[PDB]
């Protein structure tokens, strides 16, 4: 089963479809990654909505409160970033691939892709001849191998009959000339076989040349996809990369500052003035 | 409403109990955030496991199959950084608060922190000599404010008892005693409501003293907690920041590298040699 075996070009043709399917796989892949990012963002948001509420209603006041409260903002900000990845993966990468797909494969009226049919017929036309001059070069192989086994009979039937009491000038003759319609026949086919075999090696270079034709045509098509894949993945890479986004760092620089603004004393001074000895008192 | 109003110290005392609850709230807050970080990593890990298989058993081959495989790596590595966040939030932040909480609030087996009573009883204590005298002054208030109306009750019995059928002198002669004896009381009563009111001011400066003495305790306790939130929050802030890890930038360098490593031309050669014309063929 080598590429040259009549009809083994099927693998090359199979690749045109694999191409379209790989396009869909990659879309699903990026889509799944998008749903995941969105899920993380949504959770961070729920957490932020939930704890901003709980902290506000709880007995925590002052700068320590704000400090605590800054994390809800941090959570919400991270969420946004991840929704940007989701957006990028979807509106950019996903749509890009979806369009490349529709622009590279076209439906055949009957069903299937034109570029696949185009390659299928190309390989047929290019192999049609060499194959014909093989179906017979294969049939002339049986006509011979059927004699090189039919000859072992005229020699076998004359050895089994050579030892029998019911022999006659006739029965003994119906085995004599048979070793001719075989011996002189085997050579008769030994030429049929040997001929077409050389009647094939004179068209073999032509056959290879035509197959290279169609094949190169397929490599050109595959090349466009392989290259398109590299371009796309490089963009998806930059989309997922939050490790270099200055905006991401800003979130935490801001977070810290808030946490530092936390001034205990001031919070205590407040409590003394609004709930402690510092309050006004109209004595008796 | 004022803090100096007897028993209003309750608020300063309730703060103690609240301090315990805030430690717990902050714990669950970090805990939930941890759950979310783990969810994300969990999800990124399934995606990678799923797509490493789909690509391996898929028709994508060559350098491009690895540029694709490179995103599963990114997924697995981002995931680890996140299980690292959870690990910190739980093993470090949550536990740190969990120690500070328990070992700072001596919870008395029966029910109630020994730190609360310390202030509860301390307040009752400092507010006894005052709540005591106030009870005297108070009782000496509705007593005099009763003698002032006691005489004005009899004066309406003498001057308002002349239009009665034949007045009996034996009565008016002593009916004027009622209106008189009253002033003898509004003489002493007025002297008590005024004497006690001074016995009240001879303790006010001492009252406030003992009172602001306990407050300061409570303040300094609350201050322990507040400063502690500032310290533990600065630590959580760090743990959340993914930028704080070098390997983070290394993930997208390694991703980019692999992708760039994708070569169309190269990948094609391989196909031609493993499925195309390049293949070896033993001709007939
Ligand atoms: Ca304890
Ligand atoms: Ca304790």
From Swiss-Prot, chains A, B:
(Microbial infection) Interaction with HCV NS5A, as annotated region: 1-284
Question: Major place of localization?
Answer: cytoplasm
Choose any GO biological process term that the UniProt entry carries and state it: cell projection morphogenesis
Q: Which GO terms describe its cellular component?
A: adherens junction; caveola; centriolar satellite; cilium; cytoplasm; cytosol; early endosome; endosome
Keywords carried by this UniProt record: Acetylation, Cell junction, Cell membrane, Cell projection, Coiled coil, Cytoplasm, Cytoplasmic vesicle, Cytoskeleton, Endocytosis, Endosome, Lipid-binding, Membrane, Phosphoprotein, SH3 domain
- Tissue expression notes: Widely expressed.
Kindly list any coiled-coil regions of this protein. 10-259
Q: Mark the residues carrying the PTM Phosphoserine.
A: 258
**Keyword Cytoplasm found:** yes
- Origin: domain of life: Eukaryota
- What residues bear N6-acetyllysine in this entry? 38
User: What role is this protein assigned?
Assistant: Regulates the morphogenesis and endocytosis of caveolae. Lipid-binding protein that is able to promote the tubulation of the phosphatidic acid-containing membranes it preferentially binds. Plays a role in intracellular vesicle-mediated transport. Involved in the endocytosis of cell-surface receptors like the EGF receptor, contributing to its internalization in the absence of EGF stimulus. Essential for endothelial organization in sprouting angiogenesis, modulates CDH5-based junctions. (Microbial infection) Specifically enhances the efficiency of HIV-1 virion spread by cell-to-cell transfer. Also promotes the protrusion engulfment during cell-to-cell spread of bacterial pathogens like Listeria monocytogenes. Involved in lipid droplet formation, which is important for HCV virion assembly.
Family from the record: Belongs to the PACSIN family.
Instruction: Please describe the quaternary structure of this protein.
Output: Homodimer. May form heterooligomers with other PACSINs. Interacts (via NPF motifs) with EHD1 (via EH domain). Interacts (via NPF motifs) with EHD2 (via EH domain); this interaction probably stabilizes the caveolae. Interacts with EHD3. Interacts (via the SH3 domain) with MICALL1. Interacts with RAC1. Interacts (via SH3 domain) with DNM1, SYN1, SYNJ1 and WASL. Interacts (via F-BAR domain) with CAV1. Interacts with TRPV4. Forms a complex with EHD4 and MICALL1; the complex controls CDH5 trafficking and coordinates angiogenesis.
Kindly provide the name given to this protein in its UniProt entry. Protein kinase C and casein kinase substrate in neurons protein 2
Q: Which organism is it from?
A: Homo sapiens (Human)
Record lineage: Eukaryota, Metazoa, Chordata, Craniata, Vertebrata
**Full-length numbering of the shown residues:** 16 to 299 of 486
């Amino acid at each position: 089963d080598s590429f040259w075996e009549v009809g083994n070009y099927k693998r090359t043709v199979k690749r045109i479809d694999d191409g379209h399917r790989l396009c869909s796989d990659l879309m699903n892949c990026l889509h799944e990654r998008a749903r995941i990012e969105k899920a993380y963002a949504q959770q961070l948001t729920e957490w932020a909505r939930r704890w901003r509420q709980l902290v506000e209603k709880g007995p925590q006041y002052g700068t320590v409160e704000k400090a605590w409260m800054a994390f809800m903002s941090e959570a919400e900000r991270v969420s946004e970033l991840h929704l940007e990845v989701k957006a990028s993966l979807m509106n950019d990468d996903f749509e890009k691939i979806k369009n490349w797909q529709k622009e590279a494969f076209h439906k055949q009226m009957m069903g299937g892709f034109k570029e696949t049919k185009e390659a299928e017929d190309g390989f047929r036309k290019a192999q049609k001849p060499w194959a014909k001059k093989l179906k017979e070069v294969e049939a002339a192989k049986k006509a011979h191998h059927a004699a090189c086994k039919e000859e072992k009979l005229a020699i076998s039937r004359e050895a089994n009959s050579k030892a029998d009491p019911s022999l006659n000038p006739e029965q003994l003759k119906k085995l004599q000339d048979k070793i001719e319609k075989c011996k002189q026949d085997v050579l008769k086919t030994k030429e049929k076989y040997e001929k077409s075999l050389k009647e094939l090696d004179q068209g073999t270079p032509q056959y290879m040349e035509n197959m290279e034709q169609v094949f190169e045509q397929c490599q050109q098509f595959e090349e466009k996809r392989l290259r398109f894949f590299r371009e796309v993945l490089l963009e998806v890479q930059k989309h997922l990369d939050l490790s270099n986004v200055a905006g991401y760092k800003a979130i935490y620089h801001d977070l810290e500052q808030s946490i530092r603004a936390a001034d205990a004393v001031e919070d205590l001074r407040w409590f003394r003035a609004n709930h402690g000895p510092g309050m006004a008192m109209n004595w008796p």
